[PDB]
Design a protein around this ligand. Structure first.
Ligand SMILES: [Mn+2]
Ligand SMILES: [Mn+2]
Length: 345
DNA sequence: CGCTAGTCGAC
DNA sequence: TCGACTAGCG
């Protein structure tokens, strides 16, 4: 989420072209593309009608990257985090309801008005994503399925030096601490890049240009792991961390009302929630594309009990994690739906 | 007036 | 999983 993040730090963005990273590797939040591609074929999908138009839409961007001589790494989402295990399934029940608003309008004469309700009732299943994987693999493009949120997986790849930048429309990658995030990129290669070190150009930020504070701000402004206090967005969240300088974030959150002259009592559920939200941005389970094992996004710091971070992702035997990352074992049924072999073919 | 939170339209 | 436009509203 981090609503309005891009604008809040517009002073850190720079119009660039994909050709910039020619000869280098770039990870991609494939969903961003896969989703847009689902729009061009919303009705056919919402009617069982076989359509692969979203498969071509994704390749349209991939080929555009390859033409500029770049090594694209398509990343996909795997399992679901308990942080939002309920708010994500709420989309399912809210989708099937919208599924009827698209049929009823077609039963009144309104055609285009119903063609829009289908777009608002789209669901990106792992079956669809798999078709995109098959298409990319044949072209020689590497695909990797994150154990949980592609966000964390992408972040790791960049922080690890494996990829130099990350293509996405989701600003959360910034919160995770990505060095180079390419946003709003079209089919021609025109996008808006945000560099972490170039964040200090935003005067409005002030002293919150460090990874630790910047992450704290995103959480306070309202994230996917925790909603912001009623009446607290970016400007407010930034001001709080800006005035205070005590590393003890817990004590700061308690006196949040004091720093803002607003007396909004903080519930105990928020103090605990901020801890979880912070630990999810820090130690969410990713996947090592080299040693082929299941590791956390970052190394556990001093004050953290790894045996209490279940909401960040459950650990699984490396042999199983490898099959999930290769998109061979269904996330849901946990059965082998493919036999792709990287070592050989 | 600056900020936050609401729904809305188009791609 | 987005921004845009606008409102009340501290
Ligand atoms: Mn995501
Ligand atoms: Mn996200």
């Amino acid at each position: 989420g981090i609503q309005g993040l891009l604008q809040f730090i517009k002073e850190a963005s720079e119009p660039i072209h994909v050709r910039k990273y020619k000869g280098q590797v770039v990870a991609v939040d494939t969903y961003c593309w896969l989703h847009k591609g689902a729009i061009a074929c919303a009705e056919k999908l919402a009617k069982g009608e076989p359509t692969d138009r979203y498969v071509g839409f994704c390749m349209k961007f991939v080929n555009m990257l390859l033409s500029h001589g770049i090594k694209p790494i398509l990343v996909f989402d795997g399992c679901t985090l308990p942080s939002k295990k309920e708010v994500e399934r709420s989309r399912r029940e809210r989708r099937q309801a919208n599924l009827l608003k698209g049929k009823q309008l077609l039963r009144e004469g309104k055609v285009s008005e119903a063609r829009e309700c289908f777009t608002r009732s789209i669901n990106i299943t792992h079956a669809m994503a798999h078709k995109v994987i098959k298409a990319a693999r044949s072209q020689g493009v590497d695909c990797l399925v994150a154990p949980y949120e592609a966000d964390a997986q992408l972040a790791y790849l960049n922080k690890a030096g494996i990829v130099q930048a990350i293509i996405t429309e989701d600003s959360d990658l910034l919160a995770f601490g990505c060095k180079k995030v390419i946003l709003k990129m079209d089919q021609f290669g025109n996008g808006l890049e945000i560099d972490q070190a170039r964040l200090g150009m935003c005067r409005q930020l002030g002293d919150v240009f460090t990874e630790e504070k910047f992450r704290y701000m995103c959480i306070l402004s309202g994230c996917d792991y925790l909603s912001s206090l009623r009446g607290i967005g970016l400007a407010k969240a930034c001001k709080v961390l800006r005035l205070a300088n005590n590393p003890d974030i817990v004590k700061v959150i308690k006196k949040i009302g004091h720093y803002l002259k607003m007396n909004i009592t903080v519930p105990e559920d928020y103090i605990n929630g901020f801890i979880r939200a912070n630990n999810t941005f820090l130690y969410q389970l990713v996947f090592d594309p080299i040693k082929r094992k299941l590791i956390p996004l970052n190394a556990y710091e001093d004050d953290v009990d790894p045996e209490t971070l279940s909401y960040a992702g459950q650990y699984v035997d490396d042999s199983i994690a490898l099959q999930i990352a290769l998109g061979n074992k269904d996330i849901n049924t946990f059965e082998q739906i493919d036999d792709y072999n990287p070592d050989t073919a």
